[PDB]
Amino acid sequence: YYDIDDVLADGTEFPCKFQYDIPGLGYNPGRPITKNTKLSLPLWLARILAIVGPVPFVELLPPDMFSTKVMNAIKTDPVALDLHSINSHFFSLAIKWIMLFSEKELANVVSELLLQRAQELNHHASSTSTFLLKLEEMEKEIYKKSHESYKDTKRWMFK
Template sequence: MSYYDVDSILTDAQKLPCTFELEVPGLGILEGNPGEDIKPGTRIDLPLWLGEMLSIGARLGTSRLVTLDMPSALSERVMNALKADPRTVDLRSLAPHFYSLGERILELFEEEELVDVLMETFKKRAAEVSDQAHNPRGAVGDGVDFLRGLDETERQLFRAAHDRAKEMRVWSGEAKRK
């Protein structure tokens, strides 16, 4: 990803629950208490980029300032729903950049099951996205709720599939050029 990639910037801005391991004087502003200290064990939702930086001490051999927790968008409850039927889950309400968030989290956590669930989810939902994109009436009927729940990656996939299907109809003479 590029440094100037807007989707990457928005993914890094996603909130991640963090638990402070050390006392931090004067940083109470993060939890809405200016001038106060943050005590060990305090849980605060921080942007992904900040949480990652504050937890980096563990990788350098020093004591870490925070411990990162799994975000609610990738919780066990959500993973179970995705295993049951990924097409019924509204990914956009969980995280607008759901798959990008999953990718970033997998850089921080070793979760083999999460990899499998995300891959299967993308495969099954991509097939549905393709069906909706190729069916001109798909966005009118039962597909409306599904299309509203697409994350940004799936929306890009939908646009690409829809545009290619439209171009194919124009090429074959079924539709007029505009």
């Protein structure tokens, strides 16, 4: 799609291994790529390779970002967790990977994390410090929008 956040979200590398052999390597002098080779692929191409096959072309090995250690660590203290370090995209990204693999379990998890950030982001919606530095890019953009509504409504409040 046209927005920069999505097309940038597709740019991220995933550890997906090939189910099959594919001569005519476009990545170098294989020429074919031996079966079960683990090659990092951006999301854009890797997205429909898991569908089209009745065995798919790729295994979809779970990304290091989604490692159960992480999905566990985000259940402790999200508010102090640094998202911007790990990817940095999370919600723009994770939203695709939850549909792609059709995982229910973590929905209830991320659906919680994003409330817990936001009950914090209505707190920096009032007129940073260090914290603004650790938000995810898209989340950050929402912070601009909120902070601007508030600032403007305050500047209207007086003269």
